[PDB]
Design a protein around this ligand. Structure first.
Ligand SMILES: Nc1nc2c(ncn2[C@@H]2O[C@H](COP(=O)(O)OP(=O)(O)OP(=O)(O)O)[C@@H](O)[C@H]2O)c(=O)[nH]1
Ligand SMILES: Nc1ncnc2c1ncn2[C@@H]1O[C@H](COP(=O)(O)OP(=O)(O)OP(=O)(O)O)C[C@H]1O
Ligand SMILES: [Mg+2]
Ligand SMILES: [Zn+2]
Lengths: 298, 422, 149, 125, 99, 54, 739, 50
RNA sequence: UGCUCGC
């Protein structure tokens, strides 16, 4: 079917966006069992699938939001007595996006992996005003490190999972009821399941490594089976489930998802002749000669 | 769009042709000027123009840091040396502006002074860009190096008299290879030394507020009448275009312009070789109305023959004596005889049968076809017809040429009847 | 992207309606229609393309990209997003294709050719790896699949 | 600041005000003339070869045309690059071989560009 | 494959061999279908190339008309005689004793 | 914002003197005391309320 | 062979040795002459190309040269001394086949319809394919592996080619070059190249708020260090300079000097410095930084597949480089022989004539043409597959292979980025003609109506640009580069200057080119996105003739075509009378072309001559190609390259290793105008058969066909296969011979 | 295959056991369906469906 | 070793 697969396009799976690798590259990424894959997809089910307000609320909860994405203006004001950076939060956009973020949450977001900013440096004056007064760290840093803050102060995370890059509200228009789910283009399944309002019992993912690390080896096998079957059906060609089940069992029989690459094949197989014939002939042969490993003809 | 208003005159002045310089500060906006800044001196060189301005800056102003001034003054110079000091006092007081040469030749640039109804132009002897030079830091680094050397020598409180007598290290003046000599000549250090070889010239500064400025400002004007016809600047547009754009230095290879550049006889010959069938009026139109008709007629009478009022190029012109048939390889004389027979048949009758010509001339089909295609077209149920219609106007206009061509065709017919036994 | 989707939708509407009209106006015993009904070779889409109207030429699931500055070909205006200027082929194979439509069709054909050329080697390597990894398993007599060891 | 035009520039320089102004115009490499008794060749003819007096006229036609009639030919004058940095036109006169005078004549604000009307020169002959 | 150009070439060639002409298949032009159809109808043949044909085997006419016409076929260098290969025991390589 | 010294043209940094915060250059004794408030807004792009697709 | 070889000889006219001065070897004039054979004992003889094909020898002409030298300080001159043998391309100026009639071709046993243009070496016919490469001295803004949008410029002069890059890996711009140990900030290089004020640097980069916001980190990183003068920056650069493995000669504190030399000569070679004045180089790198900043926002990444940035090298440039390398090697060998012989031999004065080996250049040319691998150590160019065996399967095969073009990608992997059919190939390259297989998309064919430009003098271009009001870049600061109405004018990658109202400039330049004062192949284009006016005059650019359209009416009328048909005018007259002009890809990017007369609208600048010229030579055989599918046309071209038929009129005397002929070839009934143009009907490669489209006996299931026995019996499809069996009886070292 | 010039290989076993294994396991009648999904591959084709 | 091909 790899030769039968045409490597088509425009198969957005009904959302008209979120370009996902499907076809021979997808099968290759699945069989390689790489820890990091291209365009990871996480499907999350909602407790209240009929309400759009709850969907947008949990979306804002899971989606990473930077400070510059919500603040209306950040200005470095140099008063005659002291110089500091003033950030004005747009409460209108905050309540529009339904983010549970106030001045105190923003202040708590600062002082975290930002040149060790002391808590006394950040202060709150109004309801949506944050004042940051940095001090010289004496490690080749002076007051004119303010600019450095201007480079990364809007790029701090105030709410959401840092690994999550983009989450969208997918809707199913079934005649009985139109339900709401979350499509997350991130690489953190545990955080998505742990978030409030997300039915973690019915949350899946495309990255087999995350599923293996989070929900066990059997969940990883089931995810591999489902993903391979879905990728095969996307091209209109059908494969009996027994083949993909055998493949997943072979990939998940030592307790760890091992890929079809040379590393996984070496970790699974023991025969020296086959390891030498497949890839890395000289290295495997010299290592076997060093270990004195006797190879059977099984 | 007529010149309704503003017919301004343009005058020229040569008083300050060699004394006019243009100074532009790429880092100083036009809003702030150096009129209030007291200048001290200006170094300059006549050849290889590079002016260095030395000005003075205030200190009591709040925009000056006296502590940093003392620091930079102690850094650039010594403690109390003052023999060669970049600053007279213990503060940074003098500022140096260095000039860079934009272009070598400034003849195409001119300064324009505008007065009511007139614009005076003055050539520029040179254009330089003035930028704040950082030269005190180099002397500061040199002084820091010499202070480091002094500290190295001062490792001991009392230094014994070193027996560091300079052994005679006179190096061979090796004959340098021409490549290495060219590298040395093209080196930056050699160019900088050559520039430094020219002695400096000191000049005082006279600001715009000085009366000397307004005094010498009148030199950009010239004494002359309002309306004067310039003796020069009278070349035609064609001559100007030739000046500002000086020149670098099949048989249809030569173009129309290359044809017109050739003598009239060559033009007629090439045109008859290319077209091989054309009227006299078309030839007169192509050659041009400025050429007399008698000369064109005499030229065409030597390379063409008259057939039914039209002109057909001669056979020997198309086929030189050293040429041959590209299809059969027969000599060019047979081709000329066959073409003359074809032209005679066309003069006798407008319709020519291909089979009859092939039988009489004993030539192959392709040669007869090429002979006919040059002067005839295929008409169904009628054979081959002459491509151009009967032109009686040229015949009526020139009866003597008609009689000459008639007797020439009579001679050609006699020759053809002698050869082919007609 | 909304405008692109709407224009693609309109061109597809034209294509499918012309194809339906051609299929309805065609009489029986027609050899292309007969071979399309039995499924031996061809389909209704090929018949519509070769009789009624060729469809929108799609490169990587989208209209023809602007090879030149702000336009695909110099024969069209700049920033012009008209259907004929972006890949649409109004004429059919019977009536003949304009030079721009023929160029777009050749672009699509070459895209398909290079896609197949890459797919051949990629799937060859994938098949080699998969077989080298899976060749050890065998079904034993006790109904248990065991490896070589 | 809107981009001005040479016609309106001269109009406001003469009609709106009467104060003199220093301009910096760029003339072509070769002027439509011959070096007068300069020992030649069709070489470059710059302002250094021409004499004093009236050398040409400045015409301002309708629709914004600004031409310079320098004899039989007519060039066109357009606005150059709008410089905003300081440009001081000064006179450096070396009266003596040891001491010279630098005379600040004025400030340069606008730049003009004179170009041959190649279209007219081509359609002429 | 949608090779309508082959049918157009066949029709133009049939019209040309009927009227003694050489039709042109120039890209984005050439002789139109209407002209060759008129040339066919003028010579007494069908305006679509399909002609009444009797089966040579059974001697009975075919139920559908057959599309006849002159087509310019070109033979390729790929021959079965040059590509035919059969290998006996034969020779082997010195390094590895294989064919 | 980015400010430059009128003297030499190098970039100006913000430091604290003996009386008030001032702009200063690292290569010349030029300084400039701050009298009134100075601000430099950037107006970052506000993430729109993304539509629910499907 | 007429101009470039003389320039190469002039570049190395004098060669001398360091030892024993006042000795020299001076070349005066070099000639190639007519092709001859060295068979006769010390005597030459005219030889035809067919004789060279039969005798398995090379078709070359003796390269001779007249020289003057000093034997014993007395000047000795030679007027005719051969030095090598240049293989003569067929149908060239010096080839015997040119200026010949078909009868004279028959006398020489050569087909008159043979395209020629191929070399004959050792009896085999080799063709040098047209090489395709990226244009040199051009800024390319592209994304890196990690997604960083950087810039690259491959500055290539006649001596050195250096690709310098610029990255934004950490929000600041670093400049990377092969001569630097570590990439250094761009602001340090700015300070090293003369401009020390940061305000001037920022003005040169741009005055836009986002530009300053992006360039801020670079200024901050520069201010972190103590680099504020030119000397400090030059010292910092020299610290990052590594010696080329202990270069011979005493350094004597060359660190700052090495840094300045790398900045002046090695970095940005195409940008020239008059006398250590980096103003032009500063403006160039500032424009590059501005382009990177602008591209760092909207993803306006330039594409490599755009053929406007492609250059085509013919056999001429390759042979010129090869001859230059061989002549330099010969001169070095002669200088070494002189140094070894003159100072110690005897009072018998050494002369080069006794040591001028004539086999060097000849063997070099023969090997480079035959084997096809070119190794130029002076340019460090290691190419393969330059020459290929001319395919004599048919006339169409050779005619299509003669106009082939290979890609620089040199296919070994699945790139799938140049293999696509770009819209830039319009009118220049055939879209359908491509080899089906692994070489799909990287081996292409030229169109029916196309031309490749040569190099110009570039003098009058500069003169007209300077006279048209282009202000000198040294006269103004970089701030004017940030103005919306100021447009940069370039010239072959060099910043020619700035201009305002570029419409007038472009119109005047085009009108002057039409008038004839500027070469018709000089191209001018405008990029409004980058606001850059490009003036291209280098060779290798593809141009196509187009009819000029002025005010909705083409300049070409029926009267002009009637005069052309009658012979009053030729194509050169159309070129001179401003009727038809050549357009480049970059130039046609800005022009409006109409396919037909009815398509002409108000905004039309040119008219297409003929649409069917889009296809190539092989694609021209397809009858009604617009009614078929593109893979069908590609397969048809691929099979017609292998079509069996007659080769030429001399196919009987021709003896090749494999030849296929048709017994009774027939010209097609449906013939394209391209067939009449290429004279394919004189040499057909097929037969017309009465085909009936029907299903019969089920023996034609998938693509098969049923043949008639009586037809094959009467000569249909009858073919002839000619093979060659060659044997050699050579004399060995010992006085024994094969018998 | 598509009968457009495809070249195919033909091997002759030199052992009775190999011949029997080929006839039994790789028999055409015994491999009418693919092991991928059980669909029959050896079936009617063009000019047989029509 | 190179390259043009054949699917
Ligand atoms: N340049 C070149 N190299 C070749 C040629 N034939 C073989 N080689 C080289 O030799 C290697 C392959 O050797 P083989 O083709 O197996 O040699 P062979 O055919 O066994 O030689 P014989 O035993 O003489 O038939 C390749 O890696 C090539 O580099 C040739 O004709 N030209
Ligand atoms: N590189 C290759 N690897 C494997 N098989 C190949 C290769 N090249 C050709 N083939 C063989 O040829 C066949 C390819 O034909 P296919 O691509 O299906 O039709 P096609 O060549 O597109 O014909 P049309 O253009 O559709 O008329 C299938 C395969 O067995
Ligand atoms: Mg096949
Ligand atoms: Zn400063």
């Amino acid at each position: 079917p790899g030769t039968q697969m045409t490597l088509k396009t425009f198969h957005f799976a009904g959302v008209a966006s979120m370009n996902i690798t499907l076809g021979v590259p997808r099968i290759k990424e699945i069989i390689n069992a790489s820890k990091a894959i291209s365009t990871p997809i996480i499907t999350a089910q909602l407790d209240k699938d009929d309400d759009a307000d709850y969907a947008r609320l949990v979306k804002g909860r899971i989606e990473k939001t930077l400070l510059g994405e919500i603040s209306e203006y950040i200005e470095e004001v140099f008063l005659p007595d002291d110089c500091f950076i003033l950030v004005k939060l747009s409460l209108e956009r905050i309540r529009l996006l339904r983010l549970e973020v106030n001045a105190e949450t923003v202040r708590y977001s600062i002082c975290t992996s930002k040149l060790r900013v002391k808590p006394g440096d950040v202060a709150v004056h109004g309801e949506a005003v944050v004042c940051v007064t940095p001090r010289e760290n004496s490690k080749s840093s002076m007051y004119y490190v303010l600019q450095f803050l201007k480079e990364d102060l809007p790029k701090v995370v105030v709410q959401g999972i840092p690994e999550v890059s983009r989450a969208v509200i997918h809707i199913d228009e079934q005649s009985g009821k139109e339900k709401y789910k979350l499509l997350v283009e991130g690489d953190n399944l545990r955080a998505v399941m742990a978030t409030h309002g997300v039915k973690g019992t019915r949350t899946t993912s495309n990255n087999t490594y995350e599923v293996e690390k989070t929900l066990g080896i059997e969940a990883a096998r089931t995810t591999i089976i489902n993903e391979i079957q879905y990728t095969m059906v996307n091209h209109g060609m059908s494969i009996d489930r027994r083949h993909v089940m055998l493949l997943s069992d072979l990939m998940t029989y030592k307790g760890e998802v091992l890929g079809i690459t040379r590393f996984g094949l070496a970790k699974m197989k023991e025969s020296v002749l086959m390891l030498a014939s497949f890839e890395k002939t000289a290295d495997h042969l010299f290592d076997a000669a060093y270990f004195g490993q006797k190879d059977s003809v099984c | 769009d007529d010149p309704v208003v503003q017919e301004i005159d343009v005058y020229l002045a040569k008083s300050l042709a060699e004394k006019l310089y243009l100074f532009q500060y790429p880092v100083r906006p036009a809003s702030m000027t150096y009129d209030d800044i007291p200048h001290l001196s200006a170094k300059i060189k006549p050849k290889q123009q590079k002016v260095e301005l030395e000005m003075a800056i205030d200190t009591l102003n709040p925009n000056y840091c006296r502590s940093k001034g003392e620091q930079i003054a102690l850094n650039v110079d010594g403690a109390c040396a003052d023999e060669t000091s970049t600053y007279s006092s213990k503060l940074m007081d003098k500022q140096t502006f260095c000039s860079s040469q934009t272009t070598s030749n400034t003849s195409r640039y001119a300064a324009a002074l505008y007065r009511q109804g007139e614009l005076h132009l003055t050539p520029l002897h040179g254009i330089l860009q003035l930028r704040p030079s950082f030269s005190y830091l180099d002397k500061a680094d040199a002084k820091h190096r010499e202070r480091e050397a002094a500290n190295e020598a001062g490792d001991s409180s009392q230094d014994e008299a070193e027996d560091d007598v300079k052994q005679i290290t006179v190096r061979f003046s090796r004959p340098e290879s021409e490549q290495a000599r060219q590298r040395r000549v093209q080196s930056y250090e050699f160019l900088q030394k050559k520039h430094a070889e020219e002695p400096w010239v000191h000049l005082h500064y006279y600001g715009l507020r000085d009366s000397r400025s307004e005094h010498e400002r009148q030199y950009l004007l010239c004494p002359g009448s309002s309306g004067v016809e310039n003796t020069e600047l009278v070349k035609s547009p064609s001559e100007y275009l030739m000046m500002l754009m000086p020149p670098s230095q099949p048989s249809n290879v030569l173009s129309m312009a290359q044809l017109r550049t050739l003598p009239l006889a060559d033009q007629i010959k090439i045109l008859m070789k290319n077209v091989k069938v054309m009227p006299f009026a078309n030839l007169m139109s192509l050659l041009g109305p400025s050429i007399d008709s008698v000369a064109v007629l005499r030229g065409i009478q030597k390379v063409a023959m008259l057939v039914q009022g039209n002109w057909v190029v001669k056979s020997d012109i198309l086929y030189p004596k050293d040429s041959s048939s590209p299809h059969s390889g027969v000599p060019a004389e047979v081709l000329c005889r066959g073409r003359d027979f074809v032209m005679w048949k066309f003069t006798q009758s407008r319709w020519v049968v291909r089979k009859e010509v092939a039988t009489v001339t004993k030539l192959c089909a392709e040669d007869v076809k090429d002979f006919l295609e040059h002067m005839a077209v295929v008409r169904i149920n009628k054979g081959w017809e002459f491509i151009l219609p009967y032109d009686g106007e040229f015949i009526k206009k020139h009866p003597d040429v008609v009689q000459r061509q008639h007797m020439l065709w009579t001679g050609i017919q006699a020759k053809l009847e002698k050869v082919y036994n007609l | 992207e909304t405008l692109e989707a709407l224009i693609l939708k309109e061109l597809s509407v034209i294509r499918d309606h012309a194809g339906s009209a051609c299929l309805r106006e065609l009489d029986k015993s027609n050899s292309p229609l007969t071979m399309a009904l039995c499924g031996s070779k061809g389909s209704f889409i090929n018949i519509s393309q070769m009789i009624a109207c060729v469809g929108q030429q799609a490169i990587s699931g989208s209209r023809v990209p602007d090879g030149f500055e702000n336009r695909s070909l110099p024969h069209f205006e700049k920033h012009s997003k008209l259907p004929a200027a972006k890949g649409f082929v109004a004429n059919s194979f019977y009536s003949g294709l304009t030079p721009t439509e023929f160029f777009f069709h050749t672009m699509a054909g070459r895209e398909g050719l290079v896609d197949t050329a890459v797919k051949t080697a990629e799937t060859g390597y994938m098949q080699r790896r998969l077989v080298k990894s899976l060749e050890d398993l065998c079904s034993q007599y006790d109904l248990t699949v065991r490896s070589s060891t | 600041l809107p981009k001005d035009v040479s016609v309106a520039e001269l109009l406001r320089e003469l009609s709106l005000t009467k104060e003199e102004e220093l301009l910096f115009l760029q003339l072509p490499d070769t002027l439509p003339g011959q070096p007068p008794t300069q020992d030649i060749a069709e070489n470059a003819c710059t302002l250094a070869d021409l004499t004093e007096g009236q050398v040409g006229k400045l015409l301002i036609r309708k629709s914004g045309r600004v031409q310079l009639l320098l004899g039989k030919v007519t060039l066109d004058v357009t606005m150059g690059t709008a410089c905003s940095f300081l440009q001081e036109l000064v006179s450096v006169g070396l009266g003596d071989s040891r001491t010279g005078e630098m005379t600040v004549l004025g400030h340069v604000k606008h730049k003009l560009v004179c170009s041959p009307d190649f279209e007219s020169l081509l359609d002429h002959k | 494959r949608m090779t309508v150009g082959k049918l157009i070439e066949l029709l133009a060639g049939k019209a040309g061999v009927l009227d003694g002409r050489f039709h042109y298949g120039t890209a984005f032009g050439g002789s139109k279908v209407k002209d060759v159809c008129e040339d066919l109808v003028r010579h007494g043949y069908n305006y679509l190339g399909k002609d009444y044909v009797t089966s040579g085997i059974t001697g009975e006419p075919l139920e559908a008309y057959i599309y006849f016409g002159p087509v310019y076929y070109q033979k390729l260098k790929h021959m079965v005689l040059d590509k035919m290969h059969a290998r006996a025991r034969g020779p082997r390589a010195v390094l590895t004793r294989q064919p | 914002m980015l400010l430059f010294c009128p003297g030499c043209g190098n970039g100006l940094i913000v430091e604290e003197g003996q009386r008030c915060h001032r702009f200063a250059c690292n290569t010349c004794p030029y300084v400039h005391n701050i009298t009134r408030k100075v601000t430099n807004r950037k107006y970052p792009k506000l993430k729109e309320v993304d539509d629910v697709l499907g | 062979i007429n101009v470039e070889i003389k320039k190469i000889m002039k570049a190395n006219e004098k060669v001398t040795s360091d030892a024993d001065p006042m000795w020299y070897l001076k070349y005066l004039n070099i000639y190639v002459g007519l092709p001859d054979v060295e068979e006769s004992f010390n005597v030459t003889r005219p030889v035809s190309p067919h004789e060279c094909r039969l005798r398995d020898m090379t078709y070359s002409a003796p390269i001779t040269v007249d020289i003057e030298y000093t034997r014993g300080s007395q000047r000795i001159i030679r007027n005719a001394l051969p030095i090598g043998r240049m293989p003569i391309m067929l149908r060239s100026s010096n080839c015997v086949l040119t200026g010949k009639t078909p009868a004279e071709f028959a006398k020489l046993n050569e087909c008159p319809l043979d395209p020629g243009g191929y070399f004959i070496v050792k009896g085999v016919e080799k063709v040098i394919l047209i090489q395709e490469q990226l244009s040199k001295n051009r800024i390319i803004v592209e994304a890196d592996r990690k997604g960083a949008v950087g810039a690259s410029v491959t500055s290539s002069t006649h001596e050195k080619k250096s690709r310098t890059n610029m990255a934004v890996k950490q929000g600041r711009f670093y400049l990377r070059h092969n001569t630097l140990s570590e990439d250094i900030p761009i602001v340090i290089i700015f300070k090293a190249m003369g401009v020390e004020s940061d305000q001037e640097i920022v003005q040169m980069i741009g005055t836009e708020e986002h530009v300053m916001a992006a360039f801020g980190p670079s200024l901050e990183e520069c201010q972190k260090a103590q680099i504020f003068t030119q000397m400090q920056a030059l010292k910092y650069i020299g610290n990052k300079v590594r010696r080329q493995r202990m270069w011979g000669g005493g350094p004597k504190k060359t660190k700052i000097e090495e840094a300045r030399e790398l900045l002046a000569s090695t970095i940005l070679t195409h940008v020239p410095v008059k006398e250590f004045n980096f103003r032009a180089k500063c403006i160039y790198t500032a424009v590059m930084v501005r382009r990177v900043i602008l591209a760092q926002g909207d993803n306006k990444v330039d594409d490599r597949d755009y053929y406007g940035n492609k250059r085509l090298e013919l056999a001429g440039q390759l042979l010129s480089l090869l001859f230059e390398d061989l002549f330099k090697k010969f001169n070095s060998e002669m200088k070494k022989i002189a140094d070894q012989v003159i100072p110690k031999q005897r009072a018998a004065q050494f002369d080069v004539v006794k040591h001028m080996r004539q086999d060097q250049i000849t063997n070099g040319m023969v090997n480079a043409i035959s084997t096809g691998n070119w190794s130029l150590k002076r340019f460090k160019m290691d190419r393969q597959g330059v020459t290929q065996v001319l395919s004599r399967l048919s006339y169409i095969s050779a005619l299509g292979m003669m106009t082939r073009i290979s890609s620089q990608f040199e296919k070994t992997r699945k790139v799938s980025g140049p293999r696509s059919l770009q819209p830039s190939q319009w009118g220049m390259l055939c879209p359908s003609d491509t080899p089906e297989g692994e070489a799909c998309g990287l081996v292409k064919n030229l169109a029916l109506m196309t031309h490749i430009t040569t190099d110009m003098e570039d003098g009058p271009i500069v003169k007209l640009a300077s006279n048209l009001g282009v202000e000198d870049v040294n006269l103004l600061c970089g701030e004017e580069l940030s103005y919306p109405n100021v447009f940069l004018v370039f010239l072959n990658g060099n910043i020619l200057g700035v201009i305002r109202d570029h419409k007038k400039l472009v119109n005047t330049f085009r009108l002057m080119r039409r008038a004839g004062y500027i070469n018709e192949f000089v191209s001018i284009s405008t990029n409004l996105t980058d606001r850059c006016v490009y003036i291209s005059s280098d060779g290798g650019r593809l141009c196509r003739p187009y009819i000029i359209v002025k005010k909705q009416k083409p300049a070409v009328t029926n009267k002009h075509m009637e005069e052309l048909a009658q012979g009053y005018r030729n194509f050169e007259d159309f070129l001179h009378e401003s009727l038809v002009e050549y357009l480049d890809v970059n130039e046609e990017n800005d022009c409006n072309i109409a396919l037909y007369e009815h398509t002409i609208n108000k905004d039309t600048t040119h008219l297409e001559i003929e649409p069917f010229t889009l296809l190539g030579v092989c694609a021209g055989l397809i009858p009604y190609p617009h009614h078929n599918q593109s893979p069908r046309n590609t397969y048809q071209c691929a099979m017609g390259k292998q079509a069996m038929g007659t080769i030429g009129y001399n196919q009987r005397n021709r003896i090749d290793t494999l030849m296929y002929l048709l017994a009774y070839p027939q010209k097609p009934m449906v013939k394209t105008k391209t067939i009449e143009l290429i004279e394919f009907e004189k040499l057909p490669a097929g037969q017309n058969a009465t085909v009936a489209v029907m299903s019969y006996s089920g023996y034609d299931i998938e693509d098969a066909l049923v043949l008639n026995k009586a037809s094959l019996d009467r000569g249909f499809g009858r073919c002839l296969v000619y093979k060659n069996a060659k044997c050699t009886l050579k004399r060995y070292t010992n006085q024994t011979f094969d018998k | 295959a598509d009968f457009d010039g495809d070249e195919m290989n033909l091997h002759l076993p030199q052992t009775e056991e190999a011949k029997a294994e080929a006839l039994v396991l790789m028999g055409t009648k015994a491999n009418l369906v693919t092991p991928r999904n059980g669909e029959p591959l050896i079936a009617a084709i063009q000019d047989f469906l029509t």
